[PDB]
Design a protein around this nucleic acid. Sequence first.
RNA 1: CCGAUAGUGAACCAGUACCGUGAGGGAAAGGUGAAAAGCACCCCGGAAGGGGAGUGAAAUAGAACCUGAAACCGUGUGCUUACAAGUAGUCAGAGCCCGUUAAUGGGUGAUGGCGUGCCUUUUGUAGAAUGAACCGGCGAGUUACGAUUUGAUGCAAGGUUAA
RNA 2: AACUUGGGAGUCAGAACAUGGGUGAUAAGGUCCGUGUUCGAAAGGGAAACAGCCCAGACCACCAGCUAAGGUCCCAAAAUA
RNA 3: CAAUGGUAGGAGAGCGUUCUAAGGGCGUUGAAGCAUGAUCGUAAGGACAUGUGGAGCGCUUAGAAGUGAGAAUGCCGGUGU
Lengths: 116, 145, 112, 49, 154, 48, 102
Amino acid sequence: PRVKGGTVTRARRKKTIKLAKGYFGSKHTLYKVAKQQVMKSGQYAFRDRRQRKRDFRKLWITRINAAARQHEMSYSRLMNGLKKAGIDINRKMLSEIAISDEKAFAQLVTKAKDAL
Amino acid sequence: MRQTFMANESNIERKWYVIDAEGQTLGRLSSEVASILRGKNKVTYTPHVDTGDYVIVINASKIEFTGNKETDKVYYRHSNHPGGIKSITAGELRRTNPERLIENSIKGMLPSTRLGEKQGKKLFVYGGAEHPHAAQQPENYELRG
Amino acid sequence: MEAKAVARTIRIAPRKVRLVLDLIRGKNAAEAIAILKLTNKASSPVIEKVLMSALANAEHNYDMNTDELVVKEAYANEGPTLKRFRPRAQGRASAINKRTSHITIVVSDGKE
Amino acid sequence: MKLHELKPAEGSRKERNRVGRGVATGNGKTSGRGHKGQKARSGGGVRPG
Amino acid sequence: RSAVSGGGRKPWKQKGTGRARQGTIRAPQWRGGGIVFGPTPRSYAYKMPKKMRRLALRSALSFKAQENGLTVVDAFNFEAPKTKEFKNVLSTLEQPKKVLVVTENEDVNVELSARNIPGVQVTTAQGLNVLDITNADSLVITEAAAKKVEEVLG
Amino acid sequence: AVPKRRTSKTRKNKRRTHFKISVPGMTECPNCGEYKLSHRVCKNCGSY
Amino acid sequence: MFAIIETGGKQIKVEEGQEIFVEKLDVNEGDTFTFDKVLFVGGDSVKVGAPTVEGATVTATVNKQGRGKKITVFTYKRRKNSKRKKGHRQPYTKLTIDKINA
RNA sequence: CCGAUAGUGAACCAGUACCGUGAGGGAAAGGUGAAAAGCACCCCGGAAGGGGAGUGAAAUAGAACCUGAAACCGUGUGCUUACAAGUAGUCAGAGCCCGUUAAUGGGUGAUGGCGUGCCUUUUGUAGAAUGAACCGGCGAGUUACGAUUUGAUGCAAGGUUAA
RNA sequence: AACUUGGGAGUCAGAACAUGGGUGAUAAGGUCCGUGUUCGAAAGGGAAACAGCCCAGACCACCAGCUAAGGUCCCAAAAUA
RNA sequence: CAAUGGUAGGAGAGCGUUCUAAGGGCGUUGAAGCAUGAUCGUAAGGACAUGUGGAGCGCUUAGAAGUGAGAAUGCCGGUGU
Ligand SMILES: [Mg+2]
Ligand SMILES: [Mg+2]
Ligand SMILES: [Mg+2]
Ligand SMILES: [Mg+2]
């Protein structure tokens, strides 16, 4: 019995055209290019889901480094001092502590300056 | 995507700072000034918005140089014409148009992104003790050596 | 409140008529007629015809006045193209697409 | 056993391997015949012996 | 590509035109061309060993004797074809919508009577087949057919 | 001397930004009130 | 009134009255989860726990244990006929803080 | 077994248009509705068209007439954009509009980070190696007989039929 | 882990670095061998960019932490130690 | 507790399309198609609601195949620049 490939190619191509919703120009109306761009998008996303973890890490580094020099002490010494004191607060939490609660950041900086 | 603060233009406050150059080497002043106006000393730093402060440089002719790059350290620049390459030494800039010397040394220390240009426009370099920006109320700033 | 008039399969390329319909978009009926009758292009007589049809429809079917009538919107879109050929050189034949146009005009009293 | 609930004997039947239908099957492009040479051609191969 | 009308001329020359090289207007890629490897006239029948054919009739007749769907009736005795009477018999015997009636040898009147009752097929004792016993939810065997089926299938 | 690539819809619509017909130089006629082209004779009336 | 907790593999800063999202826990809807790994209680009374601040626990009601939005992992190698598509949905919990300890 | 790119070349005035001096070669092209009830009259127009009214369940079923996708062409607009160097995405994110298959929501995106299509062929290709203008349809390991091996099922010193 | 028997293959165009040699000119991103490694068939970090070099093998999240090669004045995370 | 980069290639499990057998169902109180949507599963994919649409079509188990297209300077038809 013959079978004619109707109503399956349509759906498969449409659910990639729709998945390319909002791409420039001809990349959001043609299957032959929408598919390539969606493939590339998935690849880029898979890389960036890793890159983000380190981008935000170094963002917290920059903020902590800026905060430390307001107290005449550098990031390297600051982190070494907290390691000596036994404090195990993430770089993220130091970033928000520095932004929000200046007194507390000063207090733990002293407790780290004194852990020399 | 949990809880990192992001600065936006409703909460950015930029201040003004005068940094004297009498007795301060080009690179070791320009790098620090670039850090200033980039905003990397703001605990509320944010990469995708222009945090960071304004900077004024007042003397800009009392710059000293190490070694003998008075005659060396020639700047080049092209006019996009065939054989259109002419050059000028650092001393000639320091006596003629010394403001450009520092204004070009710092902008080379910032990115070339659009934020880079909008940040470099926050710099006003003058070649003589007086600055015309007393209305923005500047604060002397000392350099961390 | 709105009156319709359409001319179908007009023998003019739609992009040629659209140039003229880019002037009477949103103007008053009298000013629109004065433009068409004075613009020296080919499509102009065929569109003026459509405007008179629209205004006649309005008066005879909705008994609205032909003075406060602005052109709500007027456009033109492709029609059933006629395919022909031109005998070119070295035995080769190139195609000639004689296009057409579906002219639409709606005039409104600007109310509900 | 009912005609609308029948089951074949366990492990007695197996779906055959269709070739040259998509990459995911593992036999997609070259249909398992490598790249070039006689083996890669229709009616190719060499006489036994 | 050999049975489609015409198609014998190389449609254009091999080199020089800028077109793909083609050899017949009846090749598989062409609209109107030959089919590659489709259906061919063939048979689908196979065979099984004889003893296995017998264990399958016995297995179907034992499933329809474990589920209590085997009604042995003594005889049938229909002296003229009448359908309304065969419906009365199967309802008074409480037989499901689908029943297979088994006579001894050919019983013309029993057959002509159940041809139209929708859901009933009439079969001789020798013409018993698996597809028929397995569709039927109930059986009705004449005592003579029941002794014949015991002799043949065991 | 052949188009190396397609002109996208964006480029096409961009080039023809300045490709348009101007509204005619029409003014109202003093004898009849119908519009006429400036410096031409009214075709409805036939004046000046 | 302000403290930092360590849950799953990460740390969170919390003040009572907030909704939070952490790795999946083994408690059920409406229950109370109490964290015993507190590392800093700040604000008006700062308590810098060396590893942890001893004694300070943090209690929160649990609600809406769910699954995150479907990230679709896709990767491919060009000219190699190699690609893989997999969908993923991290589980999580919505916690609301209701008390702090010190 | 095929249901109009299939099934005959030909479902339809088809070995016909058409092509060639001729042998020959050879197409494309089905579908209003239940009923033709196939739109009386009026209005603009020379007419083609149209807009009402009426027929009909339906007239974006009006004769090119069932459904009516995509390429492609338009008309509106919510959000953006005229100092910028862009394989056009991703990731981070303000501002501005909207409100669902209510779920840690939809549209657009100032600005930052990262980032040279896909196939084939190769030692190696963003490759300036090849292939595709774009959409749609069609388009390639099947069948017959025989051999070998594995699984399965009879039953076994026996198993088994062919015409 | 290894071996034996049976079913199914693909492979017979290699490449660069390091090291022992021939050939050439103690020429070549040369050519022919031996011995690793890598690429081929390998993403990730470093080498500006840069299949073969250095470090290291990606099951899938996470706005957690520690390090290798390389680094810490700015571009650009870290010592103007 | 261990394993999970991967090309030629081997093995396994599966998702889908047409048809057939049986069982059980849905359909002018609106089927199949078509369009939209912010829905579900690990993937092939599966539903639901709302519009157009005006008659057929799902589901379970099992059988068969003209069963899955993005490239062949592929063929046919439309439409671009
Ligand atoms: Mg001629
Ligand atoms: Mg190319
Ligand atoms: Mg090029
Ligand atoms: Mg080409």
